[PDB]
Design an enzyme around this catalytic site. Structure first.
Site, PDB file in Angstrom:
ATOM      1  CG  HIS A  99     -25.928 -16.671 -36.422  1.00 57.60           C
ATOM      2  ND1 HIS A  99     -27.360 -16.717 -36.479  1.00 57.60           N
ATOM      3  CD2 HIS A  99     -25.586 -15.950 -37.846  1.00 57.60           C
ATOM      4  CE1 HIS A  99     -27.861 -16.294 -37.664  1.00 57.60           C
ATOM      5  NE2 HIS A  99     -26.650 -16.148 -38.341  1.00 57.60           N
ATOM      6  CE  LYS A 131     -27.463 -16.450 -42.200  1.00 62.18           C
ATOM      7  NZ  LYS A 131     -26.802 -15.620 -41.434  1.00 62.18           N
ATOM      8  CD  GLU A 147     -29.256 -17.673 -33.240  1.00 66.01           C
ATOM      9  OE1 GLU A 147     -28.680 -17.586 -34.351  1.00 66.01           O
ATOM     10  OE2 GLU A 147     -30.070 -18.539 -32.931  1.00 66.01           O
TER      11      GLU A 147
END
Ligand SMILES: *C[C@@]1(O)C[C@@H](C(=O)O)C[C@@H](O)[C@@H]1O
Ligand SMILES: *C[C@@]1(O)C[C@@H](C(=O)O)C[C@@H](O)[C@@H]1O
Lengths: 252, 252
Positions: free
Chosen positions: B143, B170, B86
């Site tokens: 991500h 997130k 990531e």
């Protein structure tokens, strides 16, 4: 993109240009505002004619324009009568709106004029031609103080302004939700990236829309309004803070 | 909305919280960076553990965490090993990753840990439960360094993080266009409006995505990363400039 250059200011490249509005009742108040504005930093001065009291007399209007021109001889000067129809401070007949704008144009006192798209096709076309014949640029404008049209409708309006000869198409809309702010940004970006051949100005009003006043370099608005001491529309922020954000985004 | 309060900082209310990342290759550099960071202004310190070149030793990792904690006893401290998968700096085994996070959790030295969503559901749930058993909050993360998934897929992932017990979901994604930045903002707003059970952090990376790091208060990102001296991901700007913009937007 073909830019619009006024008094060494290049509209449509680099950082969005900062416009502030001068609002005054009469000659003395216009002078006091022009003087106070010497302490502020901005790119373009808009005279909001609809805040003036004696708009009935073409002579009174031109005398005030002359005072402003002479107070700020080196600043790009934009003449704007914002009709009450489009969220301004008082009504005007279409004929008298035409008279004032023609007089402003042919006086040599202003660099740019605002012309509302919805004034009527014949009057818009005639006034665009008159402006161009006298080396004045046209900010062709539209405002919705109640709601945000669809992105499709907004893009078509900006395209129509371009087709009618606007030097700078401009639209301001009122968000009723955060989603509406994104719709305005989407329309701005679509116009700028796919159809525009000249600068466009857009904004979503009110605190909800303020990001649209800050992010023009990203999403394709060539200019943005700030407030010196009093806002000329909902959502404008202090002009120095506006400049701070524009600089940070430009240099990111 | 279940906010996350860490050392009197309420994540999920008010201005987005400013996170900066500490990146040091060894104990001496971690100490020097921790000391230097004390005079920067930010809300949360993230230690980017994957930049540490002694991750082979659990003792070395915990000693570095203790050095940071000793320098900044009153700062919320987030422990993040960003996997190479990531976008991080090195590859370690899954068991090594989980062991480092468990050791961070049970040491009492950190307030929060980052756990990557796609580590595997059973391992993620077990580690979230372990964090919560030791009064540590979880920033669960995802991500995409190649491109921007659909808004819908981004929302799906943030909701999955909620389902797995994340305190703060997130997601960070890479724009290939300005349009992609709007997609990320759209996903963020959809969480705010429709799936607002806990704070979420979102960002579009790189220069084009910078506005997403500035506009969190508008669309609903609870935190944003700035750079002290070197960025920990593409698109971060100088932390003081980030703060200046956040304050302007908050007070607009
Ligand atoms: C163009 C215009 O209508 C935009 C307003 C705004 O939303 O900032 C300010 C007005 O003064 C201006 O004429
Ligand atoms: C959460 C995270 O991956 C976000 C990066 C960013 O895009 O700002 C910074 C990283 O350090 C952080 O772990």
């Amino acid at each position: 993109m073909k830019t619009v250059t006024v008094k060494n200011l290049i509209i449509g490249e680099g950082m969005p240009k900062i416009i502030v509005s001068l609002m005054g009742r009469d000659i003395n108040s216009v002078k006091a505002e022009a003087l106070a504005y010497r302490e502020a930093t901005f790119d373009i001065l808009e005279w909001r004619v609809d805040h003036f009291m004696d708009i009935a007399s073409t002579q009174s209007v031109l005398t005030a324009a002359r005072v402003i021109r002479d107070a700020m001889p080196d600043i790009p000067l934009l003449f704007t009568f914002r009709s009450a129809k489009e969220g301004g401070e008082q009504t005007i007949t279409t004929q008298h709106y035409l008279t004032l704008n023609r007089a402003a144009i042919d006086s040599g006192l202003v660099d740019m004029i605002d012309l509302e798209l919805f004034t009527g096709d014949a009057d818009v076309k005639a006034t665009v031609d008159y402006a161009h014949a006298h080396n004045v640029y046209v900010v062709m404008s539209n405002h919705d103080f109640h709601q945000t049209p669809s992105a499709e409708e907004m893009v078509l309006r900006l395209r129509k302004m371009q087709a009618l000869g606007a030097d700078i198409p401009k639209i301001a809309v009122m968000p009723q939700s955060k989603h509406d702010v994104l719709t305005l940004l989407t329309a701005t970006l679509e116009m700028q990236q796919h159809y525009a051949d000249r600068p466009v100005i857009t904004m979503s009003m009110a605190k909800e829309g303020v990001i649209s006043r800050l992010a023009g370099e990203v999403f394709g608005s060539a200019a943005t309004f700030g407030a010196v001491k009093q806002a000329s529309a909902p959502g404008q922020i202090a002009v120095n803070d506006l400049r701070s954000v524009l600089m940070i985004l430009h240099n990111a």
